[PDB]
Amino acid sequence: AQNPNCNIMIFHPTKEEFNDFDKYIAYMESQGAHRAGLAKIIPPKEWKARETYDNISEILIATPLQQVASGRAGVFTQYHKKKKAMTVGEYRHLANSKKYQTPPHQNFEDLERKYWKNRIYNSPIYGADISGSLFDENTKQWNLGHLGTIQDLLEKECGVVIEGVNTPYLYFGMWKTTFAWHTEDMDLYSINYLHLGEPKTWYVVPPEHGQRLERLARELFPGSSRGCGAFLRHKVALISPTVLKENGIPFNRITQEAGEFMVTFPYGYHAGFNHGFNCAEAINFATPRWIDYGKMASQCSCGEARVTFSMDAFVRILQPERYDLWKRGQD
Ligand SMILES: O=C(O)CNC(=O)C(=O)O
Ligand SMILES: [Mg+2]
Ligand code: NI
Ligand SMILES: [Zn+2]
């Protein structure tokens, strides 16, 4: 068995190997990459996403989200308070202000220490989940707006034609902006490209050990657990590495820098934070190996998780017993 300790693997494809996206994902899995739940892909030196980032300031962040924490430093939830619209140039200036900027630090480890010590005492503003793309239309390799669609994968594997579409999302971050512990919708893959700015630190639990994280979360967030049998689908709970280590939960960590891709694998729980002003692009995708994960994915039916139009068909075809209850949650 390849990668039996479930370490995060880092790949350096050549420009020739960067042509065929599906083939390279399958190669990474042949080497055991999926066992970690997360892999890093450094693009060949010849490749670029676009020519420059000099002209992005007029993108609108229609609903910036202020991430307000409750709890203790290592075990907290966050809620998202909606703020007035602002442009990416306005948001960058805000991120760089004395109230929100990255503090002085020695290295990524010192910054990570400061994040876990102090996150709860601040409320950073995240421009998340913005439909759109920063890849140039002429970028032919690993262009997250030109991937094969999940609807087409389902149709190719299972024969059933379904409605829905699959487009990327932009994320504009600042110091301390936070992504809570989660797997993807329908335990899909994700791919995330850090277009510009400061790093993103990731934490991940191997898919084979995901239920250990879930049992800890039920113990740490006991009211939330009574409310919903899949409350991590709400994407609000944080647990620090120190707390994970104290409770014996297997995990790994890695920091993504500008110009690098990350792939999350089916049922790989992940969480993390931004180091300072940045912009990332991410999208879900599927392979043949995902179908069995999609059939087994948990679902929130309490009403909190509320998701895209396209998840309807995935539930209806892969999980017809759950369909009725899940759709009640959506309506
Ligand atoms: O970058 C973020 O805020 C969150 N991204 C992801 O969870 C992802 O790419 O799967
Ligand atoms: Mg612009
Ligand atoms: Ni994710
Ligand atoms: Zn729920």
The alpha-carbon radius of gyration of the chain (Å, integer) is 19
| Whole-angstrom distance, CA of residue 42 vs CA of residue 261 | 6
| Backbone breaks in the chain after residues (C–N over 2.5 Å) | none
Candidates 254, 75, 103; CA nearest to 174 is 103
Q: Could you give the C-alpha distances from 76 to 28, 269, 280, in angstroms and in order?
A: 34, 17, 24
CA of 170 to the centre of ligand 3 (A): 13
In units of Å, what resolution does this entry have?
Answer: 1.4
Collapse the DSSP code of 161 into the 3-class scheme (helix H, G, I; strand E, B; otherwise coil) and give the result.
Answer: coil
Q: Does residue 188 line the site of ligand 1, with CB under 6 A?
A: no
CA of 71 to the centre of ligand 1 (A): 23
Please answer whether residues 168 and 218 qualify as being in contact, where contact means their C-beta atoms are separated by less than 8 angstroms: no
Q: Confirm whether residue 79 is marked as ligand binding.
A: no
Q: What backbone phi and psi angles, to 5 degrees, belong to 144?
A: -70, -10
| Whole-angstrom distance, CA of residue 5 vs CA of residue 143 | 31
CA of 296 to the centre of ligand 3 (A): 18
- Give the strand pairing for 278-285 and 75-82: unpaired
Residue 103's CB is within 10 A of a number of other CB atoms, namely 10
Give me the residues near ligand 4 (ion), CB cutoff below 5 Å.
Answer: 228, 300, 302, 304
Which tokens in the block code for residue 117?
């010590």
Residue 185: which region, alpha, beta or left (left: phi > 0; alpha: psi -120 to 50)? beta
Q: Does residue 151 line the site of ligand 1, with CB under 6 A?
A: no
| Whole-angstrom distance, CA of residue 83 vs CA of residue 61 | 10
| Whole-angstrom distance, CA of residue 50 vs CA of residue 237 | 35
CA of 117 to the centre of ligand 1 (A): 22
- Give the strand pairing for 169-173 and 125-131: antiparallel
End-to-end CA distance of the chain: 44
Q: Does residue 280 line the site of ligand 1, with CB under 6 A?
A: yes
Nearest CA to ligand 1 atom 2: 179
Relative to the alpha carbon of 129, which ligand is closest?
Answer: 1
Which tokens in the block code for residue 166?
């699959």
| Whole-angstrom distance, CA of residue 41 vs CA of residue 191 | 10
Enter the DSSP assignment of 72. E
| Whole-angstrom distance, CA of residue 171 vs CA of residue 232 | 20
CA of 269 to the centre of ligand 2 (A): 33
Residue 209's CB is within 10 A of a number of other CB atoms, namely 18
Please answer whether residues 68 and 79 qualify as being in contact, where contact means their C-beta atoms are separated by less than 8 angstroms: yes
254 pairs with which residues across the strands? 202
Please answer whether residues 232 and 271 qualify as being in contact, where contact means their C-beta atoms are separated by less than 8 angstroms: no
Experimental method, per PDB record: X-ray
Residue 200 alpha carbon, nearest atom of ligand 1: 1
Q: Does residue 190 line the site of ligand 1, with CB under 6 A?
A: yes
Q: Does residue 284 line the site of ligand 1, with CB under 6 A?
A: no
Residue 85's CB is within 10 A of a number of other CB atoms, namely 13
Q: Does residue 192 line the site of ligand 1, with CB under 6 A?
A: yes
Collapse the DSSP code of 11 into the 3-class scheme (helix H, G, I; strand E, B; otherwise coil) and give the result.
Answer: strand
Candidates 126, 10, 148; CA nearest to 79 is 126
| Whole-angstrom distance, CA of residue 271 vs CA of residue 269 | 7
What are the chain's domains? 1-331 (2.60.120.650)
Q: Could you give the C-alpha distances from 222 to 79, 158, 182, 209, 237, in angstroms and in order?
A: 17, 39, 17, 20, 12
| Whole-angstrom distance, CA of residue 326 vs CA of residue 304 | 11
CA of 34 to the centre of ligand 3 (A): 15
Q: Is the dihedral of CA 293, 235, 73, 91 positive or negative?
A: positive
Residue among 255, 270, 277 whose CB has most ligand 1 atoms within 8 A, to mutate: 270
239 pairs with which residues across the strands? 75
Contacts of 317 by beta carbon, 8 Å cutoff, 6+ apart: 154, 158, 160, 162
Collapse the DSSP code of 219 into the 3-class scheme (helix H, G, I; strand E, B; otherwise coil) and give the result.
Answer: helix
Q: Confirm whether residue 105 is marked as ligand binding.
A: no
Residue among 190, 205, 279, 284 whose CB has most ligand 1 atoms within 8 A, to mutate: 190
Please answer whether residues 276 and 198 qualify as being in contact, where contact means their C-beta atoms are separated by less than 8 angstroms: yes
Enter the DSSP assignment of 44. P
